[PDB]
Amino acid sequence: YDIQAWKKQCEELLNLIFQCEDSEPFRQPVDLLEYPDYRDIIDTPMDFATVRETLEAGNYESPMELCKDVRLIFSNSKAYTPSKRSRIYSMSLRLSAFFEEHISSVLSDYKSALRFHKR
Ligand SMILES: CC(=O)NCc1cn[nH]c1
Numbered sequence: 001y002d003i004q005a006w007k008k009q010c011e012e013l014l015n016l017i018f019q020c021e022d023s024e025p026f027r028q029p030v031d032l033l034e035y036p037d038y039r040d041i042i043d044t045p046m047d048f049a050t051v052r053e054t055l056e057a058g059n060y061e062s063p064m065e066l067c068k069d070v071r072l073i074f075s076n077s078k079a080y081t082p083s084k085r086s087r088i089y090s091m092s093l094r095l096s097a098f099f100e101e102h103i104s105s106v107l108s109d110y111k112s113a114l115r116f117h118k119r
Contacts, residue, residue: 013103013106017098026073063107
């Protein structure tokens with residue numbers, strides 16, 4: 001029933017993601033000195049520290065908005081990878097599976113709480 005519960009649930013899931021070794025390439029913005037052509041390929045950079053800061057600033061209205069930015073981290077990795085067998089891209093796929101497994105109930109609970117509110 002709780003329309004606000006998603007926020008702390010997302011904070012806890014972000015804490016788990018930061019503990020995951022697979023998140024290391026995605027914890028901070030991609031370094032443009034390390035990858036000079038990054039912005040030629042990627043229009044909208046995204047990373048987990050930016051997601052956490054947006055959440056903590058009260059700049060997400062719903063977990064769907066947070067989920068769209070997290071999914072953008074993964075699609076950027078897929079777009080930038082020179083190979084589907086690359087190390088960083090392979091880490092992104094495992095991390096994506098972990099994220100999707102955990103975000104599912106957060107989204108379902110939120111949508112059901114909002115439907116109850118508007119009943
Ligand atoms: C496949 C890919 O995303 N390469 C760029 C990168 C390097 N560290 N984090 C991202």
